[PDB]
């Protein structure tokens, strides 16, 4: 359910003091739903984020294993903000049966104050996601 064959293609980077992350498109993703295909949308939070206040997500794509959002946010926050985690889910929404989760990732916030993370990800699972950064070439 949770293949780690899917690339997510995630930026962050800090520019006039906001941290402009983007979110281009994946690939190489799993049949999630009846139709054959998947229908993610990703979701970017500052953990901890419990209220789910700094979580934004984007919308759902049509049913394609290789979803394109393409979009891009600018959040920074008081100083405090480089201890925490940028988290990004990958969730399939389904009203057929569940939410399909294929994987997640997440970044070090002090990382990419000090130098902005840009470029292919790989996808993590629950645990890794809240914790580890593992950027991928993917070119
Ligand atoms: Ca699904
Ligand atoms: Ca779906």
């Given at each position: 359910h949770t293949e780690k064959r899917g690339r997510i293609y995630l930026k962050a980077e800090v520019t006039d003091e906001k941290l402009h992350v983007t979110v281009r498109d994946a690939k190489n993703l799993i049949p999630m739903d009846p139709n054959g295909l998947s229908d993610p949308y990703v979701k970017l939070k500052l953990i901890?984020?419990?209220?789910?206040?700094s979580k934004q997500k984007t919308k759902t794509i049509?049913?394609?294993?290789?979803?394109?959002?393409n979009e891009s946010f600018t959040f920074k926050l008081k100083?405090?903000?480089?201890?925490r985690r940028l988290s990004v889910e990958i969730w399939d929404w389904d009203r057929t049966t569940r939410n399909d989760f294929m994987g997640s990732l997440s970044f070090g916030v002090s990382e990419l104050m000090k130098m902005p993370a840009s470029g292919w990800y790989k996808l993590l699972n629950q645990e890794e996601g809240e914790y580890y950064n593992v950027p991928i070439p993917e070119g």
């Open positions: 901890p984020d419990p209220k789910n206040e049509r049913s394609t294993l290789n979803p394109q959002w100083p405090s903000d480089k201890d």
